[PDB]
Design a protein around this ligand. Sequence first.
Ligand code: VO4
Length: 160
Amino acid sequence: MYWVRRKTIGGSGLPYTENEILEWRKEGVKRVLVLPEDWEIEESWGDKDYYLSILKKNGLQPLHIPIPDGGVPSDSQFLTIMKWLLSEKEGNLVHCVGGIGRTGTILASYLILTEGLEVESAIDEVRLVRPGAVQTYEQEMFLLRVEGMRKSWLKNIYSN
Ligand code: VO4
């Protein structure tokens, strides 16, 4: 795992053992945004519900928002994601399978929204700690759209 903004938001790949989850907890992770689809989780953990129970067992509060590999959140998903990440700001981990593409896209989105960074600046800020973050054309196009609509996203996120 890696911190983009220390003890506020970080990223990781999909754990294959409970040991890796304990390491998250030791690093200060409190909340986990789970991005892989069901089938990706069920390959390493048997059942999605079981994986999430192991997260809770280890004191982590999870939210599952499945994004296909190489893909991006839908608009409804993104609103949910950003409300989740900004509801409780400390100790947030985001993960996909590799920890690079989907994860890198959400982290970059977070910087674009909270700090007002340009897209290229946000991508490079994530690549500092996660080389190759943000992998696909669809992901880069998504980031351009978020940056262009930053004021509108913030308004919707902070409504209610
Ligand atoms: O599971 V990922 O979006 O690093 O390819």
